[PDB]
């Protein structure tokens, strides 16, 4: 029953569900289909930053993910938040492993959310950074089996004690408070996401990626949602 | 039950307790017996300012008081937090009237604390900003009589609908989310916290003041804290 | 010879050179004839705010101009800034006076930049607030008939004792320091400028406006640029 | 003729001017003999940070100094400084060698400044983080043999092609646009700053040091400044 709005950093393309043949970074809205994409040179192993960002003025989402020493991916897709998103949202990281694995590690994660009013001055803010994540972090609503503390940073999915990553694995970690992204007097709504993660598997072919995403407060993992799923949608529609 | 450290804006002293004879901005750590205050000269009906800032280095809680075309007031005290709070914290606003009575109205708060651990940029903090209040407030956990979205502010304690201050109300403010203040890594843990205020009252004698306050994640309004209790203490000892 | 991007806030429309027949706000890429606009309801003597915004990412220059009480005005323009400014930018607010007259009153100016490299956590930001003015501003330079410090505010046209805003008078205030746009590894640049004046004429047709601008950092006031060219343009062409 | 005020990384102590036998850290105002000292157990090729913090209210300038898995150093003094610097002033980092010698490379640097007046919501600010540093950084005044752009780091002493370091070297780095730090209507001042850096020496005895100074806008590199004089002072009175 979730409402999300996802940017999904794509290691494992399932092309029966319109994915291109390739890792990819894609923009989904209310759906795994993404409705945009665009060729993701993905490197095992290796630490990445992603960068998301958006204004209410020019309802575009944009996001870019980049490697030290390489080139970038960009994708941006005109849509109106306001129109798919409530009042009050929670935003996340999310990440999944099925029968095939790697791990979901996020080292850093901010946030900055804008609201400007047509009111001299009238600006509401909200930003949070996290470059270090303790073991008891009662900031974040972790779910499935997210775990923070281990090396000082957040495992979206289960790794063994050798450090080796599980399959059929998902979990999310929600900012406890609620973000407001609508006001009936805002002359202007605007945020910027940025994360650092590590994607490593011992495989040829890890899956299944990791996602930022904005929903509903009261947002849960669906019911078998591993896998190409991501731990955000019910079904592959 | 609660673990309280304040900085109280006391509109009426209450000479039996200990408070000097004029109103004035105080340090209150556990008790309604200020450990340290200051003249304050507060102008009924004008809107003021008061700022607090604490680092864990100096540790040393210090707050500036001042209204516009005025000289300011200030008050300092020497206490480390980390040996009165525990790790993490909720922040707040609280406000009472007894007998006695006065609007206490917040027309805008921002607070920023941050967390430097001695790993190379290892920085975590959080900052909000509310330059203006929602009916609707889903970021801030409202107790007693204190409700958001009358005239974009923040009304602490009840005021009837001709704009009447109400008396024997106690109503409180606290960010949803919790606050880091300590890690075992942390080098520095810092904090500062403004908010703007409006006291008004018909009366010549207005009761009985706003507080800034850090408590413990799960702090509620203790029964019967009206009127020189601020909400905060269960006695005056 | 300078190289000008800017955001106007046009007050006297000039017909005779593409202007539409009301006062608007218009994005200027080196020519006063905007390259688009947008109708804004200008109200003589109140305090309004202007937002700019622009990202490497959309490459799109959006801004918005309010009143408290009043609906927006709101113009965008894709444009490529790295095609049209150097590396190295200064930042502004120019305004003018010709025949036609009003007050050019700048109460307030923040403005944010930041470069994002595709190195880890490679954030270079700049950012500066104005909420106030002193008489002796260092960290601004100031050109033509620009003062600070008159009653806390930047007059960017000269005002006579009594307060009556001056006929043929220009003037500009540029953040002293020069601002990095662009690097061979940045992977996203963006920046947002936010300012609050006052417009206010004894006449009913004022004019001639107040734009924010982005020049070489070695820009100046051409000649004879009071009136309609804002000084910020040699001509009209 | 200059007026300092720096806390310095004294990697070799002299101790004919009044150092203690082992490297500290120490905070100088206007003399190289320290007012107050710390003991530093400074690691050779490591990367490590050092943080300053000061506000008016407390006049109270403190330095914190760590490496990642190790123990940190602090040292505070109590100095108004508004008693010592002028109104504005110009903020740097300074570093050198003598016959002894290391490499002095800052890798980042931030810092802010804040000046709240008793005006509501009247706050003046400037923030600037360096992250990364190109060949032509026009937004810093380089002094001596500083440098930028080798590897996207500040170079303060010179360093030969090899890596190796070079003695009898002087170079400082300070920010282009001047800083407030007083005004006559403000109830607040303060600022923090934030850099890491690398000392790596070939030698067993590495020296001069770095120091984070704040001095008059027109400062510049004292005649034979290199050495124990760390590009400062004038002499070692």
């Known amino acids: 029953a979730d ?57 575009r989402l944009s996001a870019v993910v980049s490697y030290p020493n390489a080139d970038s991916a960009t994708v941006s897709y005109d849509v109106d938040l306001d129109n798919v998103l ?23 994660w901010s946030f900055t ?22 073991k008891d ?3 974040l609503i972790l779910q499935g089996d997210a775990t923070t503390g281990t090396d000082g940073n957040l495992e979206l999915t289960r790794v063994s004690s050798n450090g080796s990553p599980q399959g059929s694995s998902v979990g999310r970690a929600l900012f406890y408070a609620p973000v407001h992204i609508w006001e009936s007097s805002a002359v202007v709504a605007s945020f910027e996401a940025t994360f650092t993660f590590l994607i490593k598997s011992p495989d040829s072919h890890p899956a299944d990626g990791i996602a930022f995403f904005i929903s509903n407060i009261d947002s849960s993992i669906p019911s078998g949602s591993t896998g190409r799923l991501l731990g955000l949608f019910p079904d592959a529609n």
């Not at 290796?46 to 998301?52: E, L, M, N, P, S």
């Not at 095939?100 to 080292?107: A, D, P």
């Not at 959310?113 to 303790?134: I, R």
């Open 113 to 134: 959310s804008k609201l400007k009013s047509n009111s001299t001055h009238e600006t509401n803010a909200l930003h949070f950074m996290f470059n270090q994540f303790s």
């Open 137 to 139: 972090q009662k900031d």
């Open 3 to 59: 409402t999300i709005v996802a940017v999904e950093l794509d290691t494992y393309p399932n092309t029966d569900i319109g994915d291109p043949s390739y890792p990819h970074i894609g923009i989904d809205i209310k759906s795994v289909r993404s409705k945009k994409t665009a060729k993701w040179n993905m490197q095992n192993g290796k630490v990445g930053t992603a960068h998301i960002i958006y204004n209410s003025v020019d309802k």
């Open 86 to 108: 409530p009042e009050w949202v929670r935003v996340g990281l999310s990440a999944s492993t099925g029968l095939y694995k790697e791990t979901n590690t996020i080292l850093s």
